[PDB]
């Protein structure tokens, strides 16, 4: 039980306005045949064009919302909408393109999907709110067959070319005209009352309905992300490495240890309230401080209300010492905080568009994160870059230019000349810091934080 049986029933009520008279009793086997495709009893890696909700969740990076609206059905022009914001008009003879025949529309579809997906996934999952025209338009740009490999590399084939009779992945498909072995899921099969807009609008105010196919494609994918990653959460599902995951995670641990260690040295807080991940470990194990932990799983819907986290009767006195919120997203941080908050607006291959301003951050696991909100940080200031080290000035064991920097907080810099070891460590830390910031993380600190207080920790 890993793939969707072709003999599974498909509910057709949502299809009967575009396809009147459609049988109520329908399987995926009969639907695929009605769509103009032939599977030929093939056991070659592609058992069904449609996939289960569980398979869809494992391939969230491949999700492309897709809608087709009748502009005027073999006789009328169709408006093809994608969650990339693209609208294409196909004639049978928020970017809006004029009417063109299918032979050229299919080339644009292959280019668009290839550019969007090459750094995200090995496939495409068309996310539908199926009403009929989208399913019957697939024969004009989709070809199916056995699972294949790319003609220029070892990746699975996602595109086909009728000009060269060859197959390509998303990286090698320039000039290709057909999408090959795509996957799809109809959100209407999950059990909903009412139309797409009424279901989407219950959870999201950021996507509107400008009455165009791409608006529907965007709402469809947003609703699917809500159902799979907001109202339902699965942190056991592992996702492949596609970018700088390892370096980002290692950088985050390095920055956390640096910042908290320096805050404790600079202001000598007697207690630290560590709020967030129930599996957190002390990030500064040698610190003298009374370390207290408070469990809160990552919020995937709305940011936590600070009143619910702190009140309703623990140290109780969160106003004592300092509070550490390392990716624990709250509505308004208290003044005595050290904070790491993911900025959902960041553009990256790890950060996918989400629900209601939120984003789906996929790095080993998938985390839907509430929309970044500048007002959460009104009691704090942005944490400036700094490097601090009390380790001995000694090289041990990569060519060199002497480091001059006001933010290298070390004994050698206090003494007037940064040593080789601290220069190498400073440059490595700066790279880690820049990697974490560029990945979307933002750092905030209590207004009294001053690195000038670190210089007297060398006596
Ligand atoms: C395990 C240490 C700690 C710094 C708390 N991890 C993270 O917050 C984090 C975020 C990303 C992305 N990678 N790691
Ligand atoms: Zn390839
Ligand atoms: Zn939405
Ligand atoms: Zn040094």
From Swiss-Prot:
Sequence positions that bind Zn(2+) 14: 150, 153, 169, 172
Binding site for Zn(2+) 15: 200, 204, 207, 222
Binding-site residues for Mg(2+) 2, renumbered to this chain: 69, 211, 216
Residues the record lists as binding Zn(2+) 16: 393, 412, 419, 422
Residues noted as binding Mg(2+) 1 in the record, renumbered to the chain: 67, 134
ExoN domain residues: 49-230
Domain N7-MTase, chain residue ranges per copy: 239-459
Region (GpppA-binding): 355-369
Notes on activation and inhibition: Inhibited by Remdesivir antiviral drug (GS-5734).
Catalysed reaction equations from the record: a 5'-end (5'-triphosphoguanosine)-ribonucleoside in mRNA + S-adenosyl-L-methionine = a 5'-end (N(7)-methyl 5'-triphosphoguanosine)-ribonucleoside in mRNA + S-adenosyl-L-homocysteine
Residues involved in S-adenosyl-L-methionine binding: 274-280
Protein name (Swiss-Prot/TrEMBL): Guanine-N7 methyltransferase nsp14
Species per Swiss-Prot/TrEMBL record: Severe acute respiratory syndrome coronavirus 2
Section covered of the full-length record: 5949 to 6449 of 7096
